A = this chain, B = another copy of it.
Amino acid sequence: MRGQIRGLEMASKNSQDGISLIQTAEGALTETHAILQRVRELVVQAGNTGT
């Protein structure tokens, strides 16, 4: 039982680290996203403004 409890607690640590990682990469993709929003503004604005 102490085996399972200790290993499980350290597993909780492991999982929280995972939450950290995925949180970082996610916010990174959020920035990527907003940038690409600006990109579409620059593809509409680079519609040659028609010509």
- Give residues in A with beta carbon < 8 Å to B: 2-3, 6-7, 10-11, 13-14, 17-18, 37-38, 40-41, 43-45, 47, 49-50
Contact = CB atoms under 8 A, between A and B. Distances in A.
Dominant SS among interface residues on chain A = helix
Contacts of A11: 44
Number of copies: 2
Nearest to A17: B49
16 contacts: A2-B37, A3-B37, A3-B40, A6-B37, A6-B38, A6-B40, A6-B41, A7-B41, A7-B43, A10-B41, A14-B44, A14-B45, A14-B47, A14-B49, A18-B49, A18-B50
Contacts of A47: 14
